[PDB]
Amino acid sequence: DNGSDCTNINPFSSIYSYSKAKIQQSINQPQGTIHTLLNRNKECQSLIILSAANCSRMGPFKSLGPLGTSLPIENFY
Amino acid sequence: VFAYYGLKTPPYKLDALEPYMSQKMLEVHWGEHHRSYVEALNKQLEKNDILYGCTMEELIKVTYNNGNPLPEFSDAAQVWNHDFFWESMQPGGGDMPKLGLLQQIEKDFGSFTNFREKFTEAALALFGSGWIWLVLKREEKRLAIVKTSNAVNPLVWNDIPLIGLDLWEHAYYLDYKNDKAKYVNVFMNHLVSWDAALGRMARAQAFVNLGEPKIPVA
Amino acid sequence: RQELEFLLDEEHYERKRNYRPQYFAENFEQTKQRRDYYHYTPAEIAPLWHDGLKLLFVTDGTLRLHYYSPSFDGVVVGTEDVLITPFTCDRTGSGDAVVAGIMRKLTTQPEMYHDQDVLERQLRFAIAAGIISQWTIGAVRGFPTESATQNLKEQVYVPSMW
Amino acid sequence: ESEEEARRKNWVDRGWAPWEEILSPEANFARKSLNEGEEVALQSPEAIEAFKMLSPNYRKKKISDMGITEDEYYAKQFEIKGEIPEPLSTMWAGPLVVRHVPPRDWPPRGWEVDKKELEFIRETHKLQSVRVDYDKVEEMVKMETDDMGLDRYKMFLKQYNEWVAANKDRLEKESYKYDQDYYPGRRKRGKDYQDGMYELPFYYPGQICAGKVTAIHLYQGAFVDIGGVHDGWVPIKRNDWYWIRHHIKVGMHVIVEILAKRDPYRFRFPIEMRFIDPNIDHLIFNRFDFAPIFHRDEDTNLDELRRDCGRQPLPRKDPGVKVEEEPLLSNHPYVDKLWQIHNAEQMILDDMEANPVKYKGKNLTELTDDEDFDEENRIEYSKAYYKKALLPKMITKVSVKELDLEAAFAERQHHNKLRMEAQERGEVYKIPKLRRNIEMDEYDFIHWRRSLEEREAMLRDISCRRALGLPLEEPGRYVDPSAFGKDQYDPDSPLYRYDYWGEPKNSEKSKQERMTDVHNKSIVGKGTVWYEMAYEDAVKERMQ
Amino acid sequence: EKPLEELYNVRVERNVTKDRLMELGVPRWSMWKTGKCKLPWDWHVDQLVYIEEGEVRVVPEGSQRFMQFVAGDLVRYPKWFEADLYFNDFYQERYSFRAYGD
Ligand SMILES: [Fe+3]
Secondary structure, X not given: OOOOOOOOOOOOXXXXXXXXXXXXXXXXXXXXXXXXXXXXXXXXXXXXXXOOOOOEOOOOOXXXXXXXXXXXXOOOO | OOOOOXXXXXXXXXXXXOXXXXXXXXXXXXXXXXXHHHHHHHHHHHHOHHHHOOOHHHHHHHXXXXXXXXXXXXXXXXXXXXXXXXXXXXXXXXXXXXXXXXXXXXXXXOOHHHHHHHHHHHHHHOOOOEEEEEEEEOOOOEEEEEEEEOOOOHHHHOEEEEEEEEOOHHHHOOOOOOOHHHHHHHHHHOOOOHHHHHHHHXXXXXXXXXXXXXXXXX | OHHHHHOOOHHHHHHHHOOOOOOOEOOHHHHHOOOOOOOOOXXXXXXXXXXXXXXXXXXXXXXXXXXXXXXXXEEEXXXXXXXXXXXXXXXXXXXXXXXXXXXXXXXXOOOOOOOHHHHHHHHHHHHHHHHHHOOOOOOOOOOOOHHXXXXXXXXXXXXXXX | OOHHHHHHHHHHHHOOOOOOOOOOHHHHHHHHHOOOOOOOOOOOHHHHHHHHHOOHHHHHHHHHHHOOOHHHHHHXXXXXXXXXXXXXXXXXXXXXXXXXXXXXXXXXXXXXXXXXXXXXXXXXHHHOOOOEOOOOHHHHOOOOOOOOOOHHHHHHHHHHHHHHHHHHHHHHHHHHHHOOOOOOOOOOOHHXXXXXXXXXXXXXXXEEEXXXXXXXXXXXXXXXXXXXXXXXXXXXXXXXXXHHOOOOOOOOEEEEEEEEEOOOOOEOOOEEEEEOOOOOOOOOOOOOOOOOEOOOOOOOOHHHHHHHHOOOOOOEOOOOOOOOOOOOOOOOOHHHHHHHHHHHHHHHHHHHHHOHHHHOOOOOOOOOOOOOOOHHHHOOOOOOOOXXXXXXXXXXXXXXXXXXXXXXXXXXXXXXXXHHHHHHHOOOOOOOOOHHHHHHHHHHHHHHHHHHHHHHHHHHHHHHHHHHOOOOOOOOOEOOOOOOOOOOOOOOOOOOOOOOOOOXXXXXXXXXXXXXHXXXXXXXXXOOOOOOOXXXXXXXXXXX | OOOHXXXXXXXXXXXXXXXXXHHHHOOOOEEEEEOOOEEEEEEOOEXXXXXXXXXXXXXXXXXXXXXXXXXXXXXXXXXXXEEEEEOOOOEEEEEEEXXXXX
C-alpha cells in the first residue's frame, strides 16, 4: 500500500513520485571532499572526509586568452 | 554540419612507396575508402548536435557506449584508424626501433626479435578484418600488442596507440591477393615509421610517465 | 534575543545561525563548531534605535549579554550551570533577578552610562544574580541576596575581571 | 627489507614526503636535546645552540650578528631545506602555426541560432584539416595586416556576444542558487565578475591559451586563470608537489593547453589543461583516473549519476546462472487483474440471481455499487478471521464500469439453460473454459511469443558478439566473485556454516519440530505411501 | 536538465512518417497488448517497439523520474536495460528484437 518507493508509484499517477521527490536528502554526508588513501589503495580502500572543521583559511598574509589552436604538420616525422 | 570532412593527405606522396605498394592501391585505399567514410561521418554528425561537438577520441569513446556501439561509432572509427595508418608509415625503410622505444621493448618484450615474432603471429592469427596495435597501457605503464576486430581501436580502453596496421583485405588484395604473411613481413621490414612511433610515445609521456621518481634520502 | 530576532526578521538570523562553510572555514570558531553567540551590529539595531535611548540590553538567557549605547557597543560573557543541582532546576525567576541587578547597579554606579568597562563589571553582577536564581523552585522563594551574588561573582570571574 | 627499498615503497604507495617541519624554538630544543639523554650535560653543538636560542635576546643578538633584518630572519625559518632542483628552461620544438576556429560545441543546449550562419561558422572545421609545412613557414609570412580573413570567426563572435548578453544574469543567478561559496574552478560572481570575461562555450579542447597561476592546491592541483569566469585546472597530486613546488609558483605566467571541457554543474573543474610552457611532465607520476564531480542533493539514483559522469556501473555480485540456458517466461502481468475482474463479475452476477428484485429495475450494463468507491481505499490488510492460518486479507474493489455485465449475464443464461437440460438428460453439465479465461490464456501466449522472440534474437546476438569479440555482459556490472571478504552467507567456504561434528543441535535454528508436529496432527500414522505421484500426473491420469 | 532518454541511450523517433513505417517491416512485426499492469523487464538484446494505441511511461531502476512515449513514437530499448513499464489503458505495440546490426 505504501507508495513512497519510486517503483511503487504508478507512472500515470505520479503524485506519490512527486511526494517522494519532495522529501529532502539525508545529512549522512559530512559536506566535505572525499580524500582517498593511496596507502590503502592496493588493499581494501578507505576514505577520509575533509570539511570546514578540518581546514581553515589563514587570511591575508601581506593578454590572457585562447591565443589559437595548433594546425597539422606536413613533416610529421 | 560538416566536420572532420578533410581527407588527410598522407605525410608522403601517394607514389612515394611505389617499389613496395603501388600508387593505385594507395589511391584506391585512400581515394575511395577514406572518402567514403568521412562523407558518411559528417552526414551522421549533421543530424545529432550532441555528438557533433565532440573530439574524435571522445566521440569514439562515447559512441562505443561500453560494449554497445552506436551507429556512428563505425564510420568515425574507420576514419580515425585509416588516418593513423597513413601517418604510421614513412617513405623510408624501418628495421630498427628508436632509442626511447628500444628500452621499452627490451623492458617488456625482452628482445626486438621476440617483439617482431609476436607481432607477426598476432597479425596472421587474426581471422577476418581488423587492425593490430602496439599500445602503452596507462594503468600498467607497459607496452603491449592488441588485435581488434573490424573498426575497434584501443582508445576505447584508455590506451595510447603507437603503431597500427590495416588487416582489412581492401588494403592488401590488389597487391597481394592471399599472402598476409608477406604483407606483414613487408610492413615490418620496409614500410614502418618508427620515428612517428617514438614521437607518439614522447607525446604520451605527458599522460603516462614511464620512469622512476627521485626519492630524497631523509 | 528571541524577541529581538522576532522584531528583526527572525528567519534571517535563523538562516544565518545555520550557515556552514562548504569548503573551508574562515576563522577558528567555525573549525571547532561551538554554539552560536552572534553580536548584532549597531546597523542592524538602527531601526529600533531612537534619540532618547540610553542603554539597550539583549540578554541571551544568562549566558551572554549585549549592551548598546550611542558611543560604544559590546557583549558581556556569561555562563549557566543549572545542571549542578539537577533536582530543583527552576529558571522561573532568572530574568527578574537580572533586571533587578541591572537596576541596582544603575542606581548605585553612575558611570555605567559613560564607561564601558564599569558597565561590564556591573553587568557581571546581574549575570551572577541570574545564575543564583536558577537553582531554586519558586521565583520569590529562590531570589539571591547581595552577598551571595558578590560571592558568586568573585568565585566565577578571575580577580582582574571583577 | 632495506631502508632504501622501504622508503621507496612508502614514497610510491603511501605518499610519504620529507615535508619541512617549521618548529618552534622549544620544539627544536626538545628534538635536539632528547637524543643525548636525561639530566645529562649537553655536549652536542646543536643542542647547546638551541638551548641558547631558547632566549629571545640571544636570537636578537644572532640576528644582529648575521646582519639580516627581522623580516628576513622570519622568512629564513620558512626556507626549503635539502636538495634544491635546478631551474628549468623552456624549450620550443619549432614554429607555432595557429588558427582561430570556432568551437565544435558552440550552440548551447536550449539556444536557437541562424542555421545559414551556423553553416558558415562550422565550415572552418573542414578547413582545419589542411596540412602546412612548418619548416618553410617563415618564407611565406606577410607582415601586412588588415587583409586577414576571419569572417566566420567574427560572425561567431557576434553570435556569442548575443548569447552572453542574453544569459549573463541567468548564469549568475544559477551559480548563486546552486553554489554557496566560490572555489577555484567555479564561476566568478559579485565583485570578481569584471566585464569582458570569456564564457565557457568560448573555449574548446585543443585551443592553446596563456594565463597566470592563481591558486595551488596540494591534493587537487594547480589552478590557472585564463581570462574567464571559470579558472583552469592542471591535475597535480599530493606527492609530486614536493618537487613541483620549485617550478610552479603563484603569480607565474604560463602557457597551457585545454585537454577536456566539461559541465560546471556535474564537474568541480569544467576545463582541464596541461602546462605547455613549464613542461613539468617528467615530474608527474600520480594521475587521476576519473574527473572530479559534484555529489549533490538532487541526485537520488546512483546509476544516473554514474551515467552522467561517465564512470563505470555500480559493482554487483555475479550470478552463476547463464541467461542463454534458462526457462522462458510465460506468465502475463495483466493475468492477475483479469482473474480478479472475472471473479468480481461472476460474484456480482451470481448475487443478482439471489436477489431478483434488486436485479429488476436496474440494467445490467449500467450499475453503481458506490459513488465514492476508490481503488486506493480498497487495498487493506485484515487478519481477524483465521480458520487455520492468520494472514492479512488483501481487499480489491473492482470498478463498476470495469465489469461488462451483459456478456456475463448472457453466458450465465446459456450455462444454466444447458445445466438444466443436462439434468433433464441425467448427467451433470460440465463446461471446459469461459471467455475471460481464454483471453488470459491468449495474453500468456503472446507474452510467451515475445519471450521466445527475445531469446531467439539473444542467441544470434551472442554469436555475433562472440564472433567479433564484443563482450556479452555489461563491463563493470559483475566484477567481484569473492573479492569482498567477511561476507556471511553460510556457504561453508569461509567456514560460516555450523561445525560438521554431527549437527545434532537444531533447536536453536532451523528447527523442524513444528512441521513434524503438524504432519502428525494431520496424519498420525506415517505409513508407507502406497500411491505417491505428482499433482499434474494425477490430473492427467484422471483426464487420460 | 538533460533528458533521461539521452542518459540511458534510449533512442525514440516521434511522429514517424508512413515511408519510415514501411521500412524495417513494421507491419510484419509481432504484436503485443496489455491493459493496466506493471511489467519489470530486462533487455538482453535491443528491441524496436512501435506503440500503436496506448501510452507507456517507463522509469529506470531506482530512478524517481520517468520517460513518456506516445502512440506516434518508435522507441528502441538499449541492451542491459533494467526498467519498469506501467500502463493505464489499452496498449498495443509491435515489437522486434534485433541483434548486433539491423
Ligand atoms: Fe583500410
